[PDB]
Amino acid sequence: GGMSLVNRKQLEKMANVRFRTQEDEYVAILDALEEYHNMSENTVVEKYLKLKDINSLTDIYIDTYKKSGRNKALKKFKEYLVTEVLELKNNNLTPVEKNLHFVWIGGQINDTAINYINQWKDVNSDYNVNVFYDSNAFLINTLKKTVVESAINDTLESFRENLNDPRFDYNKFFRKRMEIIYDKQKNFINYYKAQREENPELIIDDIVKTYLSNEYSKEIDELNTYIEESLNKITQNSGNDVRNFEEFKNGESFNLYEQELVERWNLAAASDILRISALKEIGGMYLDVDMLPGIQPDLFESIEKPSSVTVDFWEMTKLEAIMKYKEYIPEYTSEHFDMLDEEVQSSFESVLASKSDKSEIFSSLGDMEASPLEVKIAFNSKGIINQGLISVKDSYSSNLIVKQIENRYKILNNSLNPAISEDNDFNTTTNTFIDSIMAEANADNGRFMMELGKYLRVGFFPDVKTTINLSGPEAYAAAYQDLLMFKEGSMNIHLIEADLRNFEISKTNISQSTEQEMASLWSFDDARAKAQFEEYKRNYFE
Amino acid sequence: GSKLIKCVVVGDGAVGKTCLLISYTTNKFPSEYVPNVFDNYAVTVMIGGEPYTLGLFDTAGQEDYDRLRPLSYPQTDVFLVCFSVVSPSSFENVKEKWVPEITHHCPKTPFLLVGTQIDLRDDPSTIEKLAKNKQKPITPETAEKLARDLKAVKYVECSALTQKGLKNVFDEAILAALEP
Ligand SMILES: Nc1nc2c(ncn2[C@@H]2O[C@H](COP(=O)(O)OP(=O)(O)O)[C@@H](O)[C@H]2O)c(=O)[nH]1
Ligand SMILES: O=c1ccn([C@@H]2O[C@H](COP(=O)(O)OP(=O)(O)O)[C@@H](O)[C@H]2O)c(=O)[nH]1
Ligand SMILES: [Mg+2]
Ligand SMILES: [Mn+2]
């Protein structure tokens, strides 16, 4: 597609100037560019790192000589470098280790998550399946459920005293609920820190159930049975304990993992940090437990798609039909399928009747190849999302994402830790936190900082998506930019869709329009917040 | 495009800001759900045989983010000040909140006044529950006057659902960002 990179001869012709001294900085560039070409027995990582040297060399020439006439030629040389990265990425490939990585932490894996995972097992017999759990942390979801429920009723006690709606909308409800959740959550953190200063060998679940027994009179026998049932269930479903994943545990992002797991009860974020380190150290394809295998290309491409239905409507309808007539997943929704005409419905009933094996319904992954430089990512509505990742073991980008997540957590904790150290209510702690954010905010990180200031709200307030910017897809784009701009710790993303499309995965490798993907486990929108309000009102009145 | 146009979409919660940018950049209204993706709303446009990257940024309209939101305002070339024509509180917050806020942080930056959800003008259900007060939907003539009064460049209507005036809103957004 592109154009071969310029030779040592081709660059002097390009960067030629008259009355020129051939500088030591300029020769350094030619010297490095010559070596790059006779490097035909080296791996792509060594090659990539040459290009990084070349670019860093080019940049010091321009910083030292700001009026030189070669600058305008060397900048165009730089653009050739970034093109060669894509040449590196596309030609010399490596087979991807046949590992499918899932992550379910914080509580018991439900049958929907297992049913979905089994669809990946049944059609990828050659694939080692790994379902990551954290044996010390089975009670985080129970703790969160108890504290949030407690906070819903405490919030509604301040609503019964008052009338229908003087100014008591769903907006005031989630604001007041947020203040009460932050007092309870801070109380648990304070208890968690005190117990690990007393004896730091205590596991997380041991501290959670004493806290639950002491504050909510929870029967510890029923919680040890939940733990034993959750450990039993995951160990029969390809479980891999995080605690026996030593490279993660000894890593620098484990303190970040436990921050979200224990302090924030954000398991989406904890899962964001763990997934990338599992690729860096084991390699393979990571998948979210709400993602299904890809449907076979020539299937249902006999039924004409009606004009009166969205494409995205059609993609959901497919899976619904499969499950309705082939029942591979029980309790799967049928609501989009049940909204078509009887004739187009029986069209689905005919085509599916004609198939016997699940190989004839879901594509298999098979032998997959990829570049040692790249981590491939899934695309959704013209945007990257880490709900599908393919990476070669110890890929250059995989390390770049980890450092990107680590860097963002450094900025956050820098501004957050001083504020939470002062033991004040939510509103005061927010205001102190934001004061610090604005001080460290410029035009390059402003938009990222804009999102950090909501960090305490994540998973308890409507329309808060800080996790995306901290541990999620933003850090993957900033990494891809780091790769393409021979940089470390990119913040201001200058890349567009077509740039990022370099790292997509075939839409035939994942079905993304699943039932469970429509319900986010860590985020909710305004509309779903308004619903919850009338739901809580009636659940309290009963 | 070697030249980048920062357009920042501003306005009250639940006026159709997010759906606006999704509908425009993907040609698909997100009726089903919004996936938790890195947004990266960036359209390449050719104008007088010169390539431009149009950068679109969503914002949190709510009071709770009144101090965080302007952190994204620097380097802004054009604002879409948005209001739902079936929500006169969103329209009355254009004069009272949004136009002051952008003239405070970006005083020389032009802004389009943008009507959203126009399809819900001719919607049975939403009229009579609105008609349960003084409230009536906002006429394009009322909003064209507020545009002139507040020194907006233009008034533009659109529906993210029917994509009706949708392409025009953003066309006029680059025109604001190139005019003196
Ligand atoms: N009828 C109609 N509804 C819309 C339109 N744009 C958005 N909506 C809906 O109105 C609500 C506005 O939400 P959103 O787009 O998130 O606005 P934001 O909160 O201001 O970003 C959502 O429930 C949308 O589904 C439109 O053009 N027409
Ligand atoms: O209680 C939870 C909730 C989420 N997750 C992890 O976080 C991912 C995010 O799932 P979701 O689809 O809810 O995220 P979204 O797609 O809404 O960003 C899941 O697949 C899990 O790996 C988890 O381990 N425990
Ligand atoms: Mg929005
Ligand atoms: Mn999901």
Swiss-Prot record, chain A:
Q: Which reaction does it catalyse?
A: L-threonyl-[protein] + UDP-alpha-D-glucose = 3-O-(alpha-D-glucosyl)-L-threonyl-[protein] + UDP + H(+)
Region Four-helical bundle: start-end pairs: 4-93
The positions annotated for binding UDP-alpha-D-glucose are 103-105, 141, 271-275, 288-290, 520-522
Q: For Mg(2+), which residues are the binding ones? A: D288, D290, E517
Q: What is known to happen upon mutating R275A?
A: Strongly reduced glucosyltransferase activity
Needed cofactors:
Mn(2+); Mg(2+)
Annotated residues for binding of Mn(2+): D290, E517
Tell me which residues make up the GT44 domain: 98-470
The note describing how and how many cofactors are bound reads:
Has higher activity with Mn(2+), but most likely uses Mg(2+) in host cells. Mn(2+) or Mg(2+) are required for glucosyltransferase activity.
What domain of life is recorded for the organism?
A: Bacteria
Q: Where in the cell is it found?
A: Host cytoplasm, Host cytosol; Host cell membrane
* Phenotype upon changing W522A: Strongly reduced glucosyltransferase activity
Task: Specify the effect of R457E.
Answer: Impaired ability to recognize RhoA substrate
Question: Where are the annotated segments for Glucosyltransferase region?
Answer: 98-470
Q: What topology does it adopt in the membrane? A: Peripheral membrane protein
Briefly state the protein's biological role.
Answer: Active form of the toxin, which is released into the host cytosol following autoprocessing and inactivates small GTPases. Acts by mediating monoglucosylation of small GTPases of the Rho family (Rac1, RhoA, RhoB, RhoC, RhoG and Cdc42) in host cells at the conserved threonine residue located in the switch I region ('Thr-37/35'), using UDP-alpha-D-glucose as the sugar donor.
The UniProt comment on domains reads:
The four-helical bundle region mediates binding to phospholipids, such as phosphatidylserine and phosphatidic acid. This promotes localization to the inner face of the cell membrane close to small GTPases.
Official protein name in the record? Glucosyltransferase TcdB
| Organism (species) | Clostridioides difficile
Give the residues of the full protein shown. Answer: 1 to 540 of 2366
Curated annotation (Swiss-Prot), chain B:
The UniProt note on how this protein's activity is regulated states: Regulated by guanine nucleotide exchange factors (GEFs) which promote the exchange of bound GDP for free GTP, GTPase activating proteins (GAPs) which increase the GTP hydrolysis activity, and GDP dissociation inhibitors which inhibit the dissociation of the nucleotide from the GTPase.
(Microbial infection) O-AMP-threonine modification, residue list: N36
Q: At which residues is (Microbial infection) O-AMP-tyrosine found?
A: Y33
Per the Swiss-Prot or TrEMBL annotation, the motif Effector region is positioned at 33-41
Naming one, the record's GO cellular component terms include: phagocytic vesicle
Hydrolase found in the keyword field: yes
Q: Which Gene3D superfamilies match?
A: P-loop containing nucleotide triphosphate hydrolases
Q: Which GO terms describe its biological process?
A: actin cytoskeleton organization; actin filament organization; adherens junction organization; cardiac conduction system development; cardiac neural crest cell migration involved in outflow tract morphogenesis; cell junction assembly; cellular response to type II interferon; dendritic cell migration
Matching entries from SMART domains are given as: RAB, RAS, RHO
Reproduce the UniProt comment on modification after translation.
AMPylation occurs in the effector region and leads to inactivation of the GTPase activity by preventing the interaction with downstream effectors, thereby inhibiting actin assembly in infected cells. It is unclear whether some human enzyme mediates AMPylation; FICD has such ability in vitro but additional experiments remain to be done to confirm results in vivo. Phosphorylated by SRC in an EGF-dependent manner, this stimulates the binding of the Rho-GDP dissociation inhibitor RhoGDI.
Places the protein is found: Cell membrane; Cytoplasm, Cytoskeleton, Microtubule organizing center, Centrosome; Cytoplasm, Cytoskeleton, Spindle; Midbody
Record text on subunit structure and interactions: Interacts with CDC42EP1, CDC42EP2, CDC42EP3, CDC42EP4, CDC42EP5, CDC42SE1, CDC42SE2, PARD6A, PARD6B and PARD6G (in a GTP-dependent manner). Interacts with activated CSPG4 and with BAIAP2. Interacts with activated CSPG4 and with BAIAP2. Interacts with DOCK11/Zizimin2; the interaction activates CDC42 by exchanging GDP for GTP. Interacts with DOCK9; the interaction activates CDC42 by exchanging GDP for GTP. Interacts with DOCK8 (via DHR-2 domain); the interaction activates CDC42 by exchanging GDP for GTP. Interacts with IQGAP1. Interacts with NET1 and ARHGAP33/TCGAP.
Q: According to its UniProt entry, what is the function of this protein?
A: Plasma membrane-associated small GTPase which cycles between an active GTP-bound and an inactive GDP-bound state. In active state binds to a variety of effector proteins to regulate cellular responses. Involved in epithelial cell polarization processes. Regulates the bipolar attachment of spindle microtubules to kinetochores before chromosome congression in metaphase. Regulates cell migration. In neurons, plays a role in the extension and maintenance of the formation of filopodia, thin and actin-rich surface projections.
Protein name in UniProt: Cell division control protein 42 homolog
> What is the source species?
Homo sapiens
